[PDB]
Amino acid sequence: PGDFGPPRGEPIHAVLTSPPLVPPPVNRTYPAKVIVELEVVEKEMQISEGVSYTFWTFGGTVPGSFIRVRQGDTVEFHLKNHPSSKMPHNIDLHGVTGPGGGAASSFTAPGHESQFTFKALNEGIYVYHCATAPVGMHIANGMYGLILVEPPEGLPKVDHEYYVMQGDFYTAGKYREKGLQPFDMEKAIDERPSYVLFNGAEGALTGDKALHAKVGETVRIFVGNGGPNLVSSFHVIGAIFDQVRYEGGTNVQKNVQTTLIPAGGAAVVKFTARVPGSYVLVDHSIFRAFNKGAMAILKIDGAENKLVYSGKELDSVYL
Amino acid sequence: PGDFGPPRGEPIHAVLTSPPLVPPPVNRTYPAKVIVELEVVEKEMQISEGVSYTFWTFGGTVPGSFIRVRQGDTVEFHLKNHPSSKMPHNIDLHGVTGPGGGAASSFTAPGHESQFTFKALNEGIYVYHCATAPVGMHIANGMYGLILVEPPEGLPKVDHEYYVMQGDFYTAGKYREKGLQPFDMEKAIDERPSYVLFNGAEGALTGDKALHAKVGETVRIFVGNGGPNLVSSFHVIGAIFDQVRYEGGTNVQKNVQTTLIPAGGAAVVKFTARVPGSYVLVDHSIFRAFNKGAMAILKIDGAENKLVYSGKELDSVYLG
Amino acid sequence: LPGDFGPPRGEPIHAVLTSPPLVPPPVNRTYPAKVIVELEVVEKEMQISEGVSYTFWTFGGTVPGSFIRVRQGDTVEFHLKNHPSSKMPHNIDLHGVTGPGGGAASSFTAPGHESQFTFKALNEGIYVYHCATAPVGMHIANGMYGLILVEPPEGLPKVDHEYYVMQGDFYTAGKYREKGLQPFDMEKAIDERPSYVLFNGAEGALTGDKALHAKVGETVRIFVGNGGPNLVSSFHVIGAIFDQVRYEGGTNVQKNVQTTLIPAGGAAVVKFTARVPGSYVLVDHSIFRAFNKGAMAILKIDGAENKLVYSGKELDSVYL
Ligand SMILES: O=N[O-]
Ligand SMILES: O=N[O-]
Ligand SMILES: [Cu+2]
Ligand SMILES: [Cu+2]
Ligand SMILES: [Cu+2]
Ligand SMILES: [Cu+2]
Ligand SMILES: [Cu+2]
């Protein structure tokens, strides 16, 4: 079970990436001791235009910092809780084998740092999240991210890797009602989200912050679903998934339009850019995408291929 | 990736089928140019007994006309919008590689026709739907269908193929409230459908409109889910799926009772009819099936096989 | 027909059914048998939560119902016994049955009656059974569901522990944890707004004294049903990773899965090895169900700490 022995070499200080970026491959044939530091920050951010929300974050972003390790690594986790935090936080990583996936070993009061160590026994793409009572509220405020545990051979090389995470959010106000929106427990219990978002905001991955790729380039997206409650009917408008690591497992389904991502679950999708234009990540529970903000953009630039996609060729009158 | 060369032979004028029928296998060894013509029609139809609804349709049905092509085919798509239409419409086919799955290239005003061409690069079974703002409304009014992209070698032969598509519907009125029912945007945004239906109506596939097969016949169902919002726990009462193309992909799960069909997704199920009687397609989120209309019938004709299924053999007094 | 091994051989087998969370032993058999299965329906008030009661409708006195274990190709002679204290008739649809209603049509049983019907278990798998008496949603919601395992001919790979767990959504007239005898609420059920989401028919059915157990080093197989009626489980074990999932209960496996979707009226099989001692939590990771509606069950692991795998908290320090 990832039995590649005791750690070797110098301890590696993991470099974490902010969404939507992914750390490079560990490019490593031996297990290492990997030191991971992650700081909780409670901060007001823009959930929608003119709409503020008090997010609780791992590394100041929703989703939180991406962590990349190799199956068989020993991970020395340091959870820091900023002095400015109103409350304690902890971490459950779905990649941990042990109680609370770390929750029991990571209670961190404001201004404190918890250290715990775990072996990454299983390859996969694992949701991590705060596991502080009430757990649903901590998740709903943005306390989730992904940790990639590579297989020992590493993943097949691609041109672009991206980090995207859906979440459902519960404001006291309705969708696009302006001002600082409190969290709404009643709506959260009833699974009636006001917003459904990729990367913590309407337009988090639109305009200048859109994902980018070129015609001919292979694209892998690690797609997390923090929930707390919703299951994503995950689709890219104008693309087909060549490969889906369905529910984030090792085995693949091929030629998929739309894949179900469980709440507190993940998937990996892979496809090749072939036509320039705007491609739209959506929850194909489609009112979420077009009426609650579940939309992110991948812009493809490069030469037109009119043999693959012509664009509109003729308009005519019809009786 | 569907690189079988330039289209060859005679240009094909696709014969589309109305649900629940499927066009025949393309039975071709070569990539072709396939001309597809599909007319949008807005029309009042019966959604339930004494209940009407203004459906928006590709080809006059919900779901829309079934399109069948081969991986590697160049599809020349003609979207016609009937002059009677109040709204413009377009089409996003999940089988299209490029912006909006064709939405960007298919804006069609009433009494207009849009032409756009694409290559079908990926085999699979793909939802198509209108992508006109508000997109959720156009889908909710029934603007969805399936396009089958065959592998180059074709699908394994079966006795029957059926076309079935779940949708969730949002009427101002409650379930079975009589009269012409408007669309309800509030129920749609809140994912609180008044009806969940196979093929656009309560009883669309019941009685004289049931699917049919005979004892001993292999059945393939292309099972679409137009949504807009619900995920189907898709089950056939009294059958087990020998094979499921889970999420409509190439690989297969075997021996599955109930398979989750994503909103804007599809599956293929295969089983063999062994025992005569009525088999019920349901959303096994079971209040949908028995209280909101999500039920369709497959009638199996032929000889009883009491060694597989006896029927009720005995009723006895029980004191317990 | 793979799964047809001809008619029963040897002496009839009187099946022993197990109450959750226990499973019958592997059958360990090389021939098709006539397996006589007897299952009694009992309607009874039970505690759904501390100081809250509910009138459950049960197969064999438990929610979920008694676990049935047979071999692919067995002839099952089913005896459904409805206790005369029952206020409703009941029947049974087993998702492992090939034929009308999965047996529902052959097992209509008035109070104080016994129905017999016979079927061949043609498909290996892990199948939901449930009552199919109108209103079907209500019979399921009152707890009439369980699992029947149809082993492959050679049996499943040996494990240290097999457990039986089944999620249900429940609809009370009152709110979550309001005390007293809670009526079924049909309006909440139709709206898919459960007051409780539970493992094995009650808050704490699988907590404290009733927790599951294994030892460090031991392989665990959990047969996870979802009776619904309406919800899909984002099924996770806090602190564990599924080495293998039989996704949607099918024969093929996915490897290294955190959270697997279990359809309404569906099932999965998860396998993992206990490596670290402590408390592991079965949840619906639609996580407000788990921590606000009671969708929480416990697996206690006992044995030697392994600090190389999980150290526990090593240091608390103060930082700016
Ligand atoms: O087969 N069950 O609804
Ligand atoms: O890891 N479960 O919330
Ligand atoms: Cu927290
Ligand atoms: Cu979790
Ligand atoms: Cu339209
Ligand atoms: Cu779509
Ligand atoms: Cu019953």
Short mmCIF file of C-alpha atoms and ligand atoms in Angstrom, two decimals, chain A residues 235 237 284 286, chain B residues 92 94 127 129 139 264, ligand 6:
data_model
loop_
_atom_site.label_atom_id
_atom_site.label_comp_id
_atom_site.label_asym_id
_atom_site.label_seq_id
_atom_site.Cartn_x
_atom_site.Cartn_y
_atom_site.Cartn_z
CA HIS A 235 -19.53 19.77 -18.56
CA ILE A 237 -19.44 23.67 -23.44
CA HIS A 284 -25.16 21.10 -16.39
CA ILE A 286 -28.12 24.09 -16.01
CA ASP B 92 -25.47 23.15 -28.90
CA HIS B 94 -22.39 17.90 -27.05
CA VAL B 127 -27.25 15.53 -25.75
CA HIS B 129 -30.19 21.36 -26.81
CA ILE B 139 -34.19 23.47 -22.30
CA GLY B 264 -27.15 17.24 -19.91
CU CU D 6 -25.14 21.42 -22.82
#
